[PDB]
């Protein structure tokens with residue numbers, strides 16, 4: 001288990017998300033699904049010119065898995081996945097994101113729902129989750145587990161639990177008062193409201 | 208001068224944009240600026256780990272250049288730019304875009320303003336332009352000019368006019384009835400309405 005610090009501005013953004021009063025939390029799901037879609041776009045695109053990249057799974061889809069007993073909502077995709085390095089650079093640093101622009105926007109009148117415009121939508125997970133686990137598998141690396149309850153750090157370790165094939169799985173350990181998002185009709189409502197046009201099957205599992 | 212065919216679905220999307228009655232054309236600028244921003248994000252990001260990528264220009268900005276005499280609106284950025292190959296793959300084929308999802312969305316109630324959600328916002332240029340020229344320079348290639356008046360094809364050639372350094376320049380040869388978008392106050396209005404939060408300076412040139 002390796003423990004890393006978030007880049008300062010990331011930590012600041014996370015704090016903002018966790019601490020700002022903002023009721024319209026449901027947008028977290030849209031942003032996660034949107035990331036999934038992007039990742040699926042990427043493998044689809046690369047696999048045009050190299051079909052062997054599908055050897056780890058041809059089906060391109062997104063699964064939504066609620067679990068009331070564990071109080072978790074899991075979003076799984078069969079997208080391109082992330083290597084260890086992608087994982088650490090993309091989740092722990094500003095990278096190609098508009099972290100700064102977002103935080104500045106928030107001061108100039110913008111609202112949190114616009115987070116996706118700035119390439120940092122993943123962190124909206126922290127509107128509803130006390131902890132977030134990201135399990136990922138890229139064709140070019142082994143399976144890794146990223147994890148963070150915020151507070152300025154995250155961990156990365158190899159994951160030898162259930163091999164995934166290829167893709168990314170985001171496990172949301174929900175806050176106590178956010179169990180709303182484990183309810184079939186609530187989830188259905190949100191997907192219809194915000195993600196009806198996504199170009200990949202979205203399957204909502206039942207319990 | 209090499210002449211290429213658009214991938215069928217691209218050609219179909221372009222036709223849709225050109226032929227669909229849709230008054231809210233001003234969104235074209237938002238989408239172009241958004242592409243610019245993304246491209247600037249990318250060079251910013253790569254230049255963290257390799258500062259020599261800025262040798263071709265350290266300033267990261269977007270310029271808006273109207274020209275009433277030529278009836279053109281030009282959008283210039285100092286982003287990462289595109290190689291010849293990126294140019295041909297990214298503008299001529301579906302690539303990583305949601306072209307299909309967009310066109311399907313349009314049938315299921317979506318509207319053209321949502322084009323950006325599907326990674327094909329560039330083509331909104333054809334709401335206002337009869338022709339679009341894209342001049343680009345990536346650190347890893349020479350300067351190239353892409354061009355298309357739609358109708359199913361585009362051309363690519365080396366550009367030895369004015370070297371750019373690094374970046375992408377989108378020249379919009381406006382349709383006769385769209386000279387609206389050469390007016391300083393109109394442009395100002397649109398940038399404020401749709402692109403106020405972009406994280407790079409946007410400079411509007413005067414004539």
Ligand SMILES: CC(C)c1cc(C(=O)N2CCc3ccccc3C2)c(O)cc1O
Pocket residue numbers: 032033035036037038039040042077079080081082122134136167168170
């Ligand atoms: C944890 C967040 C950030 C996240 C990342 C991915 C992912 O694997 N990439 C892989 C690389 C890539 C390439 C293009 C577009 C998006 C992505 C995201 C995903 O599928 C879902 C997610 O919710």
Ligand SMILES: CC(C)c1cc(C(=O)N2CCc3ccccc3C2)c(O)cc1O
Pocket residue numbers: 239240242243244245246247249284286287288289329341343374375377
């Ligand atoms: C003609 C359209 C498509 C377009 C492309 C670019 C561009 O150079 N890339 C370069 C590669 C890249 C990488 C990440 C995000 C966007 C972009 C767009 C741009 O700066 C502006 C544009 O309006």
